[PDB]
From a paper:
Here, we describe the crystal structures of the N-terminal RD and the C-terminal ED of the lantibiotic resistance-associated RR [name] from [name]. [name] is part of the nisin resistance operon. [name] belongs to the OmpR/PhoB family of RRs.
The structure of the [name]-RD was determined at a resolution of 1.8 Å. The asymmetric unit contains two copies of [name]-RD. [name]-RD structurally adopts a αβ doubly-wound fold previously observed in OmpR/PhoB type regulators. Five β-strands (β1-β5) are arranged in a parallel fashion constituting the central core of the structure, which is surrounded by two α-helices (α1 and α5) on one and three helices (α2, α3, α4) on the other side. Superimposition of the structures revealed that helix α4 is slightly rotated outward in [name]-RD. Furthermore, helix α4 in [name] is shorter than in other RRs. The putative phosphorylation site of [name] is Asp55, which is localized at the end of strand β3 and lies within an acidic environment composed of the side chains of Glu12 and Asp13 (highlighted in pink). However, the structure of [name]-RD did not contain any divalent ion. Instead, a water molecule is present, which interacts with Glu12 of the acidic pocket, Lys104, and another water molecule in the vicinity.
Author numbering:
A (entry chain A), B (entry chain B): 4 to 120
The structure:
Amino acid sequence: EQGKIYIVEDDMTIVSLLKDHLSASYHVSSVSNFRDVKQEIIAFQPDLILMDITLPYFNGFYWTAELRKFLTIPIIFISSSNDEMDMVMALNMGGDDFISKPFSLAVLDAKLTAILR
Amino acid sequence: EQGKIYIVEDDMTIVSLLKDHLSASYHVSSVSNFRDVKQEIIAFQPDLILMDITLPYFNGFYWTAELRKFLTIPIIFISSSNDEMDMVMALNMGGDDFISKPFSLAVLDAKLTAILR
């Protein structure tokens, strides 16, 4: 009965890192097929999505707006240190929060805790 | 046809129409291999890029940010009339203007003339 987190990320290092860390406290799944994310989300029923918006061949901006037609669950963006994002931007893009790479797991933990309640 | 325009677009109908319309005034190229877009842009050396930011599996904002590490040329985003794209977003993501599908060719022509001036 742990909270379910779905991770949209193509970097297997990052995915492994997050699965290792978060699995103690959450049911964590990552994308299997990037062309099937709507079905994967319908089937998995996550409580929260971690959405990397820096993936070259998965348009995180497009897909967040598409998912927002259907979902009210929190979406936390994973952004780049390079990129300069803020909460106004995150909200206008359909997100609830953001965290920039490279990030501390401690900061991610605090954000996950606060948001999931 | 001296000005060079590169179009990042996977709708082949839009590419065909734009190539045909712009042929009179511009040297126009589009994507040959979506795995090699950055390299094609480096090879073609456009004066302007039309970057569709609605492609589900090519992250237009990511690639604009990558291109902005070494190009200062104008980039006009192609968006969708029902999405949340506005000028604040266009400029914040490294673009210089945007045009929303479906769009007027007269508006595109005016935008191209103005920003290539």
